[PDB]
Short mmCIF file of C-alpha atoms in Angstrom, two decimals:
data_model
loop_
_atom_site.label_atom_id
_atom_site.label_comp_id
_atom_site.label_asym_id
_atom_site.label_seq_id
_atom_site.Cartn_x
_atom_site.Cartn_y
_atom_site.Cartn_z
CA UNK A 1 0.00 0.00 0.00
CA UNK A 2 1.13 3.60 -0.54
CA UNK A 3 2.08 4.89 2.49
CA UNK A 4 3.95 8.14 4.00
CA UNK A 5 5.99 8.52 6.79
CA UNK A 6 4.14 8.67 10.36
CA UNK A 7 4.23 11.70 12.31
CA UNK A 8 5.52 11.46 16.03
CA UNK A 9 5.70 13.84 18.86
CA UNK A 10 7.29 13.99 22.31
CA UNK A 11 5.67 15.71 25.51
CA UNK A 12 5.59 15.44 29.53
CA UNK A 13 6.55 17.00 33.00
CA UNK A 14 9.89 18.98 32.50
CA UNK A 15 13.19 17.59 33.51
CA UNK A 16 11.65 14.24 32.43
CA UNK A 17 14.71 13.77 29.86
CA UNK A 18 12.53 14.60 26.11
CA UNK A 19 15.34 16.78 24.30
CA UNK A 20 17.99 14.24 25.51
CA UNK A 21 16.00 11.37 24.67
CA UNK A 22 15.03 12.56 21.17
CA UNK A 23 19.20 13.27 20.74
CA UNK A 24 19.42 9.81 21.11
CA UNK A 25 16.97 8.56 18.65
CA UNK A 26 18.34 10.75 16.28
CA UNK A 27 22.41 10.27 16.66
CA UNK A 28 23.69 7.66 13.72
CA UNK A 29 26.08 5.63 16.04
CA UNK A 30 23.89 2.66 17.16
CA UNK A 31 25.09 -1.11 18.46
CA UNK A 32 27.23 -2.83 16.23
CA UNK A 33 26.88 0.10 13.31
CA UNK A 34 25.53 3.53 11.90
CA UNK A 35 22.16 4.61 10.94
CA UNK A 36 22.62 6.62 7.66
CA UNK A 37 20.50 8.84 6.39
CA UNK A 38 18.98 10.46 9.22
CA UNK A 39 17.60 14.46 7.65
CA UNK A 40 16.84 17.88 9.38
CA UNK A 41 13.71 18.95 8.62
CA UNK A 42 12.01 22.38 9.69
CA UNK A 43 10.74 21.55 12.82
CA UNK A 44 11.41 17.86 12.68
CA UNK A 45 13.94 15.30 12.06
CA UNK A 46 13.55 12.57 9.05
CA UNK A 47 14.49 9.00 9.46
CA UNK A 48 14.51 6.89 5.97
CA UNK A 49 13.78 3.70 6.81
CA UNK A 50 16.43 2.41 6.42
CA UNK A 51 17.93 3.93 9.51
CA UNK A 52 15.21 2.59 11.54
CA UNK A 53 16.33 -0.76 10.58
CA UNK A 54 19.58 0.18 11.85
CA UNK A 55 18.09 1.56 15.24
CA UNK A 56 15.79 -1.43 15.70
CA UNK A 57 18.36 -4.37 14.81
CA UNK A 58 18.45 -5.53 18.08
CA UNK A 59 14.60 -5.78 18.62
CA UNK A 60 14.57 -8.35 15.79
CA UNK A 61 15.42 -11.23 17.77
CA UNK A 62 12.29 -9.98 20.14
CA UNK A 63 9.73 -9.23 17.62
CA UNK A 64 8.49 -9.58 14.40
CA UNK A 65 9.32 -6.38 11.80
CA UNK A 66 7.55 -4.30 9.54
CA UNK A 67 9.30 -1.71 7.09
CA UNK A 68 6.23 -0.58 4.80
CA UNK A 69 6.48 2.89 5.26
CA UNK A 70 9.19 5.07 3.82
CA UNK A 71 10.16 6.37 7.03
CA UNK A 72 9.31 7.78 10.38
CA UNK A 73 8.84 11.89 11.33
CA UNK A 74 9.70 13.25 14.69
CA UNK A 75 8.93 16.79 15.66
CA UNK A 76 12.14 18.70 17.08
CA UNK A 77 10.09 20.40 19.68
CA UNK A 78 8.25 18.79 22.79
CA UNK A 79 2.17 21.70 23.27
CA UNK A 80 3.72 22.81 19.99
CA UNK A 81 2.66 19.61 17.81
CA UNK A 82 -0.75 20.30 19.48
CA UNK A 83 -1.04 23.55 18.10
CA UNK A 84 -4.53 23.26 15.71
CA UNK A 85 -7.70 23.34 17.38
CA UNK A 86 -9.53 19.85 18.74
CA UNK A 87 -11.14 18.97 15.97
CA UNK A 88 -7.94 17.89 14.02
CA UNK A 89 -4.48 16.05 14.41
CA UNK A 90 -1.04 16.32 12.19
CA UNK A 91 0.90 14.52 14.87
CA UNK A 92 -0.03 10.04 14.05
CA UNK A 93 1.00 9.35 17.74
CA UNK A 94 2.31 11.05 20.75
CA UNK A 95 5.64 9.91 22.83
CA UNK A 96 4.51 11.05 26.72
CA UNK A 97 7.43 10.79 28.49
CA UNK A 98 7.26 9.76 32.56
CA UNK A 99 10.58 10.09 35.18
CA UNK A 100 10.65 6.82 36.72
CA UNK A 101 12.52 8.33 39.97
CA UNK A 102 9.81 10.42 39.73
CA UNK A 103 6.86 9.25 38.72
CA UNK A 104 3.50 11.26 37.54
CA UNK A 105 3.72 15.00 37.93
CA UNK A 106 1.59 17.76 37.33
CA UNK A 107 2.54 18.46 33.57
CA UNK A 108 2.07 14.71 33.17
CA UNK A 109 -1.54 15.11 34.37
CA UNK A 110 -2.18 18.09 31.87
CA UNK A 111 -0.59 16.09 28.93
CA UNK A 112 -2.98 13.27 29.57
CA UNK A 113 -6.12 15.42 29.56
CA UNK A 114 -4.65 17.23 26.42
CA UNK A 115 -3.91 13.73 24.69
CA UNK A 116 -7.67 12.33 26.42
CA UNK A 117 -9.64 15.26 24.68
CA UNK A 118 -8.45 14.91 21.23
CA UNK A 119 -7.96 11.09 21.36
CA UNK A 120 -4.71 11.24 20.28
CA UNK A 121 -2.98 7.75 19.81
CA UNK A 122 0.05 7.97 22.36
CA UNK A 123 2.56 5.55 24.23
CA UNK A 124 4.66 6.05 27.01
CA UNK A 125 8.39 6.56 27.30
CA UNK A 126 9.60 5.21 31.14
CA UNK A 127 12.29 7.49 30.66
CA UNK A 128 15.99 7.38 33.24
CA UNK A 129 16.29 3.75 33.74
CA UNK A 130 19.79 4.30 33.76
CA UNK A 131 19.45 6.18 37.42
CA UNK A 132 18.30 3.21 39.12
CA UNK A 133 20.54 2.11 41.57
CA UNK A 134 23.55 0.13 40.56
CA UNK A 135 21.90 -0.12 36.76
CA UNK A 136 24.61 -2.03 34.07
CA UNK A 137 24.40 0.12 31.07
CA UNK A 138 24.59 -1.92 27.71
CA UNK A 139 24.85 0.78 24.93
CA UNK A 140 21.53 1.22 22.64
CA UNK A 141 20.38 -1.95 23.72
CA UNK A 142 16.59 -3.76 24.00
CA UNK A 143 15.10 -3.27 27.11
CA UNK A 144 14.59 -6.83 27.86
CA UNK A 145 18.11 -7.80 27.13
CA UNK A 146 19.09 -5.07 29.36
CA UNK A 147 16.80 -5.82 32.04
CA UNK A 148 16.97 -9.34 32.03
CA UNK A 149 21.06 -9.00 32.51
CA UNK A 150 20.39 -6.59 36.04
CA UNK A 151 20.93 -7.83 39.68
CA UNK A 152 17.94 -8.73 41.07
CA UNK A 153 17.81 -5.94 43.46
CA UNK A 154 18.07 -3.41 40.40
CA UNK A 155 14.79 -5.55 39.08
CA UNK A 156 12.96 -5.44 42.05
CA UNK A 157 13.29 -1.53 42.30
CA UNK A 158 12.13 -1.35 38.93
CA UNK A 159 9.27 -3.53 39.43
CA UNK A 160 8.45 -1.27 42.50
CA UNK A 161 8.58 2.09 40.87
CA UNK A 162 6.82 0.58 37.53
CA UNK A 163 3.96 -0.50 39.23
CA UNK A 164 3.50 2.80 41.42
CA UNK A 165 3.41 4.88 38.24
CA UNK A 166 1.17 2.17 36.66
CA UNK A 167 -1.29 3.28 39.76
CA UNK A 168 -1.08 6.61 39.33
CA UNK A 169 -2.07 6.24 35.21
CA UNK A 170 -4.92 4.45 36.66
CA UNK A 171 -6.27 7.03 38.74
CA UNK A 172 -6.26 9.36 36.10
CA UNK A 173 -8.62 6.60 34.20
CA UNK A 174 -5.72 5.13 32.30
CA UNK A 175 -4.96 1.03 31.85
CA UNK A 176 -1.24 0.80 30.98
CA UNK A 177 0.86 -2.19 30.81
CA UNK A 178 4.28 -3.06 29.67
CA UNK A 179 4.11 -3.23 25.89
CA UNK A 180 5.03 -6.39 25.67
CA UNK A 181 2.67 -7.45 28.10
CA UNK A 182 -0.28 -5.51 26.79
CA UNK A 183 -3.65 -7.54 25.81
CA UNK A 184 -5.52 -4.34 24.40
CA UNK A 185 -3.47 -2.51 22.39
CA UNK A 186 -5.79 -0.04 21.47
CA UNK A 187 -7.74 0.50 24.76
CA UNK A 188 -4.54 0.07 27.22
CA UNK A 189 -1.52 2.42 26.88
CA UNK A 190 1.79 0.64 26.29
CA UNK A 191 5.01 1.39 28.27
CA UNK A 192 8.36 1.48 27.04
CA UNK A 193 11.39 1.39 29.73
CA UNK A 194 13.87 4.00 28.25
CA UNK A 195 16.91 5.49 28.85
CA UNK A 196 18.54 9.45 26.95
CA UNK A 197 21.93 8.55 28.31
CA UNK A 198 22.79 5.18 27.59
CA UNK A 199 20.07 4.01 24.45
CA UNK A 200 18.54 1.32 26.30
CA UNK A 201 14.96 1.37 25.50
CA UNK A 202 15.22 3.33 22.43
CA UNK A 203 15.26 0.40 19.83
CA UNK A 204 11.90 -0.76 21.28
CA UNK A 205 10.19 2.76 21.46
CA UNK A 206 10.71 3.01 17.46
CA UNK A 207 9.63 -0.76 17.40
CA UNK A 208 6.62 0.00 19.03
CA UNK A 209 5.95 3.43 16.69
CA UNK A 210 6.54 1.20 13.59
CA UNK A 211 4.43 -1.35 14.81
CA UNK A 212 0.96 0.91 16.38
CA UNK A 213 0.79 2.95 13.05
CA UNK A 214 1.98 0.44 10.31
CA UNK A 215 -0.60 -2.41 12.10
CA UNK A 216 -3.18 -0.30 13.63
CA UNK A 217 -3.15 3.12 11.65
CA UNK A 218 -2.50 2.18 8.13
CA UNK A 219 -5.69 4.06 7.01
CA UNK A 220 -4.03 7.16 8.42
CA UNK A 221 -0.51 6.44 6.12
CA UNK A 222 -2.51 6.43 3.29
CA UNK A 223 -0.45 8.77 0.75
CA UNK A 224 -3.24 11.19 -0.69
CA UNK A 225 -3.57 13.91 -3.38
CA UNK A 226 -5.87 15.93 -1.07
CA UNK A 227 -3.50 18.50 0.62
CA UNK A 228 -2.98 18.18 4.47
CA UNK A 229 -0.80 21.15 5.79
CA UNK A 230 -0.53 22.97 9.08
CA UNK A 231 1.35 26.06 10.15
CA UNK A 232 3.82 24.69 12.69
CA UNK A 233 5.73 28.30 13.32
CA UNK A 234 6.49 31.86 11.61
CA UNK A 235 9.34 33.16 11.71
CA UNK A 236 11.30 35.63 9.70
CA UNK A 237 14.25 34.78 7.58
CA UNK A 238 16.61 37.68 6.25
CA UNK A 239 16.58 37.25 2.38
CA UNK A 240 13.09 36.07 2.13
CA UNK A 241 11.30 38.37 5.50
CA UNK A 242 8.43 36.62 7.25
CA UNK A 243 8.17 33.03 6.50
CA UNK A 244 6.05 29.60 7.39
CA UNK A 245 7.00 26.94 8.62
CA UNK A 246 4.61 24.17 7.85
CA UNK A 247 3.91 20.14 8.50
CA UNK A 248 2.85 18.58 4.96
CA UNK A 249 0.72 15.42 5.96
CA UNK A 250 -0.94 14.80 2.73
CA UNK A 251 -0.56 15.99 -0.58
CA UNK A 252 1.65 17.83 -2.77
CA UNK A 253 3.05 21.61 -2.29
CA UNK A 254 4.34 23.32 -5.76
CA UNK A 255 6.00 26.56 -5.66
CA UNK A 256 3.01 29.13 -7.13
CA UNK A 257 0.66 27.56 -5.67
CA UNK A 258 -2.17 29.76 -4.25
CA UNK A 259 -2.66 29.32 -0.77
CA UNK A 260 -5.15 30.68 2.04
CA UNK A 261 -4.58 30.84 5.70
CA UNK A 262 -5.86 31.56 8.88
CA UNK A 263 -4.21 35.45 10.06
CA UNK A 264 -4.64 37.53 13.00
CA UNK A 265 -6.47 40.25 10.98
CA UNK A 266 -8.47 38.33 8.69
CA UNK A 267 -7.59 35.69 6.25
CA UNK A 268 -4.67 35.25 4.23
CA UNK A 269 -4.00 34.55 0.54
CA UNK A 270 1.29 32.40 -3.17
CA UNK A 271 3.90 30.46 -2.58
CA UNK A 272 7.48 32.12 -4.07
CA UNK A 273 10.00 28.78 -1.98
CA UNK A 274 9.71 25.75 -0.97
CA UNK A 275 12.71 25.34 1.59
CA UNK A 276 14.23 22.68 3.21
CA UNK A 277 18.09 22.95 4.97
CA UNK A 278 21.05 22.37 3.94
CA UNK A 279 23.25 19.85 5.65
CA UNK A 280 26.72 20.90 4.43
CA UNK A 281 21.47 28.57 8.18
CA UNK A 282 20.84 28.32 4.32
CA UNK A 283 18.59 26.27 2.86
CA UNK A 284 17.57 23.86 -0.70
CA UNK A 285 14.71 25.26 -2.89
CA UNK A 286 12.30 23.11 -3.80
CA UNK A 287 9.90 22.85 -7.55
CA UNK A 288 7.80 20.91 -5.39
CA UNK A 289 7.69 18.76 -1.94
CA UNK A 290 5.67 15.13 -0.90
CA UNK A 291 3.94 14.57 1.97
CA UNK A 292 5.32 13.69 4.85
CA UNK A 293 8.02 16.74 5.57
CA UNK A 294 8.07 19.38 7.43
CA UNK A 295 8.91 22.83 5.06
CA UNK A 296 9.10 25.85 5.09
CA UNK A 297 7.53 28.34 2.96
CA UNK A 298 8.36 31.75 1.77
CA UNK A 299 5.76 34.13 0.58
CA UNK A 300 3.71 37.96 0.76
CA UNK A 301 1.75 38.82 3.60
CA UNK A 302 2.98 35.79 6.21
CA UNK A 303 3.59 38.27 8.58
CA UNK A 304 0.13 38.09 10.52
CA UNK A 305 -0.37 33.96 10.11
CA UNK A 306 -1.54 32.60 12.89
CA UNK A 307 0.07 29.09 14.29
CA UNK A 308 -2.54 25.89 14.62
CA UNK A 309 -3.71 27.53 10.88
CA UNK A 310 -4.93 25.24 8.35
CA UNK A 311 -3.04 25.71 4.96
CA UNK A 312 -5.31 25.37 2.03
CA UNK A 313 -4.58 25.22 -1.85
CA UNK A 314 -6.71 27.25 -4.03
CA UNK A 315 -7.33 24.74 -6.84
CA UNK A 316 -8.69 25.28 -10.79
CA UNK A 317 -12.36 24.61 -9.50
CA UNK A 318 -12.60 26.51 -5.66
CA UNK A 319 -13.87 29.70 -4.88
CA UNK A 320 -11.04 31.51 -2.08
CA UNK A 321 -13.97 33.22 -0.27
CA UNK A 322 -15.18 29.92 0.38
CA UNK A 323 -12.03 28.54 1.28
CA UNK A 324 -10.95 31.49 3.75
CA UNK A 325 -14.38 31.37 5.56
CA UNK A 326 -13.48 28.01 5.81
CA UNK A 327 -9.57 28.28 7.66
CA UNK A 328 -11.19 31.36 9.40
CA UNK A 329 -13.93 29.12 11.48
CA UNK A 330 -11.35 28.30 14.30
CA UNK A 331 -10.06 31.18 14.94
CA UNK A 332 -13.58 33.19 14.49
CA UNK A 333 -15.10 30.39 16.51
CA UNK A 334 -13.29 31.21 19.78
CA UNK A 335 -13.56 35.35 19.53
CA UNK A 336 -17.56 34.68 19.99
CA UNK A 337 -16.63 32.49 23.08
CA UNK A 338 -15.75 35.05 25.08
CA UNK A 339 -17.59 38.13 26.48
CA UNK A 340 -16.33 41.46 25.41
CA UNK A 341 -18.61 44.25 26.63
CA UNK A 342 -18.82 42.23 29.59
CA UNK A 343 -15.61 42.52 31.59
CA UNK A 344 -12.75 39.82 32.69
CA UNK A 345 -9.24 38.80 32.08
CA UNK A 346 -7.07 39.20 29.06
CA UNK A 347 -5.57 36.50 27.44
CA UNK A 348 -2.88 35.28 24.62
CA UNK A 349 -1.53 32.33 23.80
CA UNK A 350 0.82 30.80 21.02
CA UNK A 351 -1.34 28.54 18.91
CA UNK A 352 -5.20 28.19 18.30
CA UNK A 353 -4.83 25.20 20.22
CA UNK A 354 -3.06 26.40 23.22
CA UNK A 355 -5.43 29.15 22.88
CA UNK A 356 -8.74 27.13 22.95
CA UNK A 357 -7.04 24.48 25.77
CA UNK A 358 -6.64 27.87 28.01
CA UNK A 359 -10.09 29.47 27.60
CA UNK A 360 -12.18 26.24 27.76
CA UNK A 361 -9.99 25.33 31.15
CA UNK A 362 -10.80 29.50 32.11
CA UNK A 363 -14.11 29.20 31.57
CA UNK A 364 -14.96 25.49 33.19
CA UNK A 365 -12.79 27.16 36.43
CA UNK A 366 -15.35 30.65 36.40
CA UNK A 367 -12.91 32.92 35.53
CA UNK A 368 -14.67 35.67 32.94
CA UNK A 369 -12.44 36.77 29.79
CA UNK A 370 -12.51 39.77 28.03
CA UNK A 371 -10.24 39.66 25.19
CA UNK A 372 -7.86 37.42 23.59
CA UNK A 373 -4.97 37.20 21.38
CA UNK A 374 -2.20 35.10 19.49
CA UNK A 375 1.97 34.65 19.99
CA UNK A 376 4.18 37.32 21.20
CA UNK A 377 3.32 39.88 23.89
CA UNK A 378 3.88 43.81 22.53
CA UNK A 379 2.55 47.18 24.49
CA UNK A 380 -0.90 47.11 21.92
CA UNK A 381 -1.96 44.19 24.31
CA UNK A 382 -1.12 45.14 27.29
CA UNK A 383 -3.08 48.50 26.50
CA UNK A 384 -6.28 46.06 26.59
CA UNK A 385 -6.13 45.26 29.91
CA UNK A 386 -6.25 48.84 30.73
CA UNK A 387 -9.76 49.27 30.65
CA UNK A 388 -9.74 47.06 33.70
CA UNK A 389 -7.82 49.47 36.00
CA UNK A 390 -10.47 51.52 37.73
CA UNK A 391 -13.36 49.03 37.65
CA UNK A 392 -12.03 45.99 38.88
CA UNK A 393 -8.21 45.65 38.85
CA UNK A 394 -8.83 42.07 40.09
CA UNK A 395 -8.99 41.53 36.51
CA UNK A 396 -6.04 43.73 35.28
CA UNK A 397 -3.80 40.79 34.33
CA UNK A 398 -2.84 39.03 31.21
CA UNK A 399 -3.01 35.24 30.93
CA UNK A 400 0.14 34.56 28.70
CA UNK A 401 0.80 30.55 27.56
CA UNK A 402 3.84 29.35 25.86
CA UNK A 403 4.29 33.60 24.15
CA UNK A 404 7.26 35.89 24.46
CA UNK A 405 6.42 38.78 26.42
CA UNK A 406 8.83 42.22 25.17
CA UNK A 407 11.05 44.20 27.62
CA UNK A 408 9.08 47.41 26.01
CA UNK A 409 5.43 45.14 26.93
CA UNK A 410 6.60 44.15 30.98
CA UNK A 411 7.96 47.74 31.37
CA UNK A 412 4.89 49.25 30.29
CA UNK A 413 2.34 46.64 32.54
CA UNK A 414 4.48 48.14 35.85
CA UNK A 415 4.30 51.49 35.04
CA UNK A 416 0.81 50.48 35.58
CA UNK A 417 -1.19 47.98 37.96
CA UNK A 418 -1.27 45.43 35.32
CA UNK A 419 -0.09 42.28 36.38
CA UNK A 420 1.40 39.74 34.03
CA UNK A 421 1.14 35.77 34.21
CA UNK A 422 3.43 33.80 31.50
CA UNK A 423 3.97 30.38 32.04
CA UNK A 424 3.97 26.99 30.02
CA UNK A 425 1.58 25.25 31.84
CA UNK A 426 -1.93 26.18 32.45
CA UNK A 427 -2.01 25.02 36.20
CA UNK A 428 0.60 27.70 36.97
CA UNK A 429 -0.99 30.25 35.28
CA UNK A 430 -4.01 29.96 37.30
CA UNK A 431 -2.10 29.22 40.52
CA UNK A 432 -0.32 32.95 40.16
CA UNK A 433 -3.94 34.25 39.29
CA UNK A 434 -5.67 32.54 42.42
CA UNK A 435 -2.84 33.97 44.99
CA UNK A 436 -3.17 37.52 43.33
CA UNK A 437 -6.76 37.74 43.66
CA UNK A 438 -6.22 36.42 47.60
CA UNK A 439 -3.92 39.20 47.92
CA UNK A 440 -5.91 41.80 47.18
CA UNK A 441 -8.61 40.45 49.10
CA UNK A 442 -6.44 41.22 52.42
CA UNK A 443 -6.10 44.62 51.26
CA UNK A 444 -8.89 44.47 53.51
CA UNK A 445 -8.46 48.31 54.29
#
């Protein structure tokens, strides 16, 4: 069957190992060999398939194998792949990543609900094996080679800790098991023992990717005409200005090609480069990219796109006033969601995603907002939470997830009483908000 690569993403608590472990997955040096081949992307590393072979030699002996697809997709950076609204997913299957000296943690809990409410396929990665005590470290090996070669001390510690953390998934309504021991593979998340520093694990984590999508997800890999695209980031690039940098999941991009968008002032409408890098930052031009990559693309007018934006192509046959009504919806759909002449809390947030995530937590936890807005803080949005001085300063604040706040923006807030909340997790956010509004409530008089 024709298939494309699978898309894969990484998330969990911080200091739970994700940029080290995804280092790992992507360095050629394996047991016994190299894995060639392995590509920088925008925003996410390529593996032919080849080089998965390479990386998943020594699971053969444990497993069976499947090499249908043409390779696998990572994304380079750990919310960010869950960056279009609910309704939709680019990323095939999430990595969540859990400390095993540590456990479940709060950003753990958030990840699960965020995974839970788009139903997004997703294993987990037992991450720091290697910190158990008096662990033998066998280079990139399998897990159960590994583990089976450990004192039995070091195996009863992991059995200990495993099946702790295996509580805790269950109280937040989650059946996991050991995914070799798992009897629903589709109902009951599968664990993968891994370790960033010394490999161990890794082989079976890309076994296990390979063999969820390729077995269970095939419909998904279906190569199509029909042209999947979402704005991962925008960013500006010297001899081309502002730029997008987009995952292609379906489809094919051709350099001309007319394209709408979602923007922050209204929609969007072609494409002058299709860029990928260059290995040996400047980049290759492209007449024309195949789904899967991740590319960048250089046109007019990108400066106001908005990130979670659909990318559509303006074909021979479509109207565009249809089509930007259409990539408009989600970000239309949550300005009528909150309540404007009534009077709350600003907010802004990176993607439409993190956006929506934020407001529908806001408004399930009573707190009223007033306006909203998308990626990088500036003085204009501060200026909106002005109105709320005199009134009810309670509500003088900006809500900030996952966006750059300026020096010029912060200065401005404490010059007056507006207080500023940025953080990358929505628990803290509201945290900071609940203590400030219990500190003004002792300035009794």
């Amino acid at each position: 069957k024709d298939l494309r690569s699978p898309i894969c993403c990484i998330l969990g608590h911080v200091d739970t190992g994700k940029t080290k472990l995804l280092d790992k997955i992507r360095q050629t040096n394996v047991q016994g060999g190299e894995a060639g081949g392995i590509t920088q992307q925008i925003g996410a590393t390529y593996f032919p398939i080849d080089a998965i072979k390479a990386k998943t030699k020594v699971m053969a002996e444990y497993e069976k194998q499947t090499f249908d697809v043409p390779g696998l997709l990572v994304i380079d950076t750990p919310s960010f792949s869950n960056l279009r609204s609910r309704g939709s997913s680019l990323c095939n299957i999430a990595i969540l990543v859990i400390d095993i000296m540590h456990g479940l943690e709060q950003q753990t809990i958030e990840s699960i609900k965020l995974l839970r409410d788009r139903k997004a396929p997703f294993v987990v990665a037992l991450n720091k094996i290697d910190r158990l005590y008096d662990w033998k470290a066998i280079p990139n090996n399998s897990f159960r080679d590994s583990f089976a070669k450990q004192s039995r001390a070091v195996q009863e510690e992991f059995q200990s800790r495993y099946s702790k953390i295996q509580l805790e998934l269950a109280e937040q309504g989650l059946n996991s098991e050991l995914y070799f021991q798992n009897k629903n593979m589709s109902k009951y998340v599968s664990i993968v023992p891994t370790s960033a520093v010394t490999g161990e694990g890794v082989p079976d984590l890309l076994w296990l990717l390979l063999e969820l999508t390729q077995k269970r997800m095939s419909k998904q890999l279906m190569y199509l005409s029909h042209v999947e695209a979402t704005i991962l980031e925008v960013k500006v690039v010297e001899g081309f200005g502002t730029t997008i940098d987009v995952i292609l999941s379906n489809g094919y991009l051709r350099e001309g090609d007319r394209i709408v968008l979602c923007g922050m002032n209204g929609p969007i409408v072609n494409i002058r480069a299709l860029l990928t890098p260059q290995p040996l930052s400047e980049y290759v031009h492209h007449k024309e990219v195949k789904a899967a990559l991740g590319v960048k693309i250089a046109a007019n007018d990108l400066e106001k796109a908005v990130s979670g934006s659909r990318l559509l192509v303006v074909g021979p046959e479509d109207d565009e006033d249809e089509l930007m009504d259409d990539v408009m919806d989600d970000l239309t759909g949550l300005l009528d969601s909150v309540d404007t002449t009534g009077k709350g809390v600003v907010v802004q947030a990176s993607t439409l995603g993190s956006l929506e995530a934020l407001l529908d937590f806001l408004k399930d936890m009573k707190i009223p907002v007033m306006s909203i807005g998308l990626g990088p803080v500036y003085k204009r949005d501060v200026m909106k939470a002005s109105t709320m001085l005199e009134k009810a300063p309670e509500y003088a604040v900006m809500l900030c997830f996952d966006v750059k706040v300026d020096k010029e923006a912060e200065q401005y807030a404490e010059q007056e009483g507006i207080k500023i909340f940025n953080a990358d997790v929505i628990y803290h956010l509201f945290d900071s908000f609940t203590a400030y509004q219990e500190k003004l409530l002792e300035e009794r008089r």
